[PDB]
Design an enzyme around this catalytic site. Structure first.
Site, short mmCIF file in Angstrom:
data_model
loop_
_atom_site.label_atom_id
_atom_site.label_comp_id
_atom_site.label_asym_id
_atom_site.label_seq_id
_atom_site.Cartn_x
_atom_site.Cartn_y
_atom_site.Cartn_z
CG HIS A 146 -1.93 -1.04 1.31
ND1 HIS A 146 -2.75 -1.37 0.33
CD2 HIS A 146 -2.22 -2.15 2.02
CE1 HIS A 146 -3.63 -2.43 0.58
NE2 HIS A 146 -2.94 -2.99 1.87
CE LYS A 202 19.86 -9.04 -17.11
NZ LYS A 202 18.91 -9.86 -18.02
CG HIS A 220 21.68 -13.96 -24.26
ND1 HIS A 220 21.68 -13.95 -23.10
CD2 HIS A 220 22.72 -13.06 -24.71
CE1 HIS A 220 22.72 -13.22 -22.70
NE2 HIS A 220 23.18 -12.60 -23.47
CG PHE A 221 18.41 -8.22 -25.84
CD1 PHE A 221 19.48 -7.16 -25.58
CD2 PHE A 221 17.35 -7.92 -26.37
CE1 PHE A 221 19.56 -6.03 -26.22
CE2 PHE A 221 17.28 -6.62 -27.19
CZ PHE A 221 18.38 -5.77 -26.95
CG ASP A 222 24.84 -10.38 -28.42
OD1 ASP A 222 25.40 -11.33 -27.48
OD2 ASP A 222 25.42 -10.17 -29.36
O1 LIG Z 1 21.86 -4.08 -24.25
C1 LIG Z 1 21.81 -4.70 -23.72
C2 LIG Z 1 23.14 -5.47 -23.55
C3 LIG Z 1 23.13 -6.57 -22.58
N1 LIG Z 1 21.94 -7.09 -22.05
C4 LIG Z 1 21.84 -8.03 -20.71
O2 LIG Z 1 23.07 -7.82 -20.19
C5 LIG Z 1 23.72 -9.29 -19.70
C6 LIG Z 1 25.32 -8.87 -20.19
O3 LIG Z 1 25.37 -8.74 -21.55
C7 LIG Z 1 22.99 -10.21 -20.36
O4 LIG Z 1 22.29 -10.80 -19.41
P1 LIG Z 1 22.71 -12.26 -18.96
O5 LIG Z 1 24.02 -12.87 -19.54
O6 LIG Z 1 22.35 -12.62 -17.24
O7 LIG Z 1 20.94 -12.83 -19.75
C8 LIG Z 1 21.80 -9.56 -21.02
O8 LIG Z 1 21.54 -9.90 -22.49
C9 LIG Z 1 20.76 -6.18 -22.16
O9 LIG Z 1 19.47 -6.69 -21.69
N2 LIG Z 1 20.76 -5.31 -23.15
O1 LIG Z 2 -10.10 0.64 -1.01
C1 LIG Z 2 -9.79 -0.42 -1.28
C2 LIG Z 2 -10.34 -1.36 -0.69
C3 LIG Z 2 -9.95 -2.98 -0.57
N1 LIG Z 2 -8.65 -2.82 -0.53
C4 LIG Z 2 -7.97 -4.27 -0.51
O2 LIG Z 2 -9.05 -5.27 -0.76
C5 LIG Z 2 -8.72 -6.50 0.04
C6 LIG Z 2 -9.97 -6.79 0.72
O3 LIG Z 2 -10.93 -5.44 0.64
C7 LIG Z 2 -7.62 -6.12 1.15
O4 LIG Z 2 -6.59 -6.55 0.84
P1 LIG Z 2 -6.04 -7.64 1.90
O5 LIG Z 2 -7.43 -8.84 2.33
O6 LIG Z 2 -4.47 -8.61 1.44
O7 LIG Z 2 -5.55 -6.86 3.19
C8 LIG Z 2 -7.07 -4.58 0.54
O8 LIG Z 2 -7.16 -3.91 1.83
C9 LIG Z 2 -7.80 -1.61 -0.72
O9 LIG Z 2 -6.60 -1.85 -1.30
N2 LIG Z 2 -8.49 -0.63 -1.24
#
Ligand SMILES: O=c1ccn([C@@H]2O[C@H](CO)[C@@H](OP(=O)(O)O)[C@@H]2O)c(=O)[nH]1
Ligand SMILES: O=c1ccn([C@@H]2O[C@H](CO)[C@@H](OP(=O)(O)O)[C@@H]2O)c(=O)[nH]1
Lengths: 124, 124
Positions: free
Chosen positions: A12, A41, A119-121
């Site tokens: 909240h 990360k 994998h994103f390179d």
């Molecule tokens: O432009 C980029 C460059 C890199 N990575 C990200 O950085 C990590 C190391 O290269 C990689 O994460 P990972 O080797 O844990 O999957 C991933 O592709 C991106 O998400 N965007």
């Molecule tokens: O205005 C509101 C009304 C309700 N709740 C939300 O709805 C759930 C049950 O009513 C509650 O989550 P909980 O049962 O994990 O406490 C929480 O307060 C809100 O977050 N905002």
């Protein structure tokens, strides 16, 4: 077990930030996609083109992988991507990122059968 | 074991036109803050005020909780909050939320020692 106080802050509290930011994207997405557990990360790119378009890169231009493997492919066109780069201020577990919206060609490694991105390179 | 193809999708795919849009705040936050594991939490509110101001509510106006518990408190002043509500489209594991910003009084349950917010009850 996570304390009730801690659960309330997790569920909240956002002191922190506002929804109207564009620059908090990487902070939230790196967290959402589980790349901030154990350590931050340092660099990660998200691609906003369709999954079909990204898969299609595996049938596009063969290029050299940064790691010297021979399974990398470059997109024929630029793609809308976002680079998430850990800031100098960032300290685990409070993983902070700068968000950079870019349009560049992507290079991915492909593997499996059918060959799909694994994998994103780099972007170029 | 997470497949390489799935790992790529998790780490690198966010298909869409306006990923960083304010309308995406709830999608990102509900995911990051672990409210889309197992099922999509249907309704959740984030508070954009300082933690001290939210803790202060525990010494403000006593109100009965919606559920009949007797440890709820209403904020003396309105607070900047964001409501996240599941759309019609939404279905696990593809949780989708409508993001709405409002300024309302909050009602929270307080517990522990020090007495701090432990449940978000309602906004008014
Ligand atoms: O432009 C980029 C460059 C890199 N990575 C990200 O950085 C990590 C190391 O290269 C990689 O994460 P990972 O080797 O844990 O999957 C991933 O592709 C991106 O998400 N965007
Ligand atoms: O205005 C509101 C009304 C309700 N709740 C939300 O709805 C759930 C049950 O009513 C509650 O989550 P909980 O049962 O994990 O406490 C929480 O307060 C809100 O977050 N905002």
């Amino acid at each position: 077990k996570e304390s009730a106080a801690a659960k309330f802050e997790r569920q909240h509290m956002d002191s922190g930030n506002s929804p109207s930011s564009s620059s908090n994207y990487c902070n939230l997405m790196m967290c959402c996609r589980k790349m901030t557990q154990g350590k931050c990360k340092p660099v990660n790119t998200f691609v906003h083109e369709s999954l079909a378009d990204v898969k299609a890169v595996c049938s596009q231009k063969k290029v050299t992988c940064k790691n010297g493997q021979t399974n990398c492919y470059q997109s024929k066109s630029t793609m809308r991507i976002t680079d998430c780069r850990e800031t100098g201020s960032s300290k685990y577990p409070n993983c902070a990122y700068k968000t950079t919206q870019v349009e560049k060609h992507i290079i991915v490694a492909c593997g499996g059968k059918p060959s799909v991105p694994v994998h994103f390179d780099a972007s170029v």
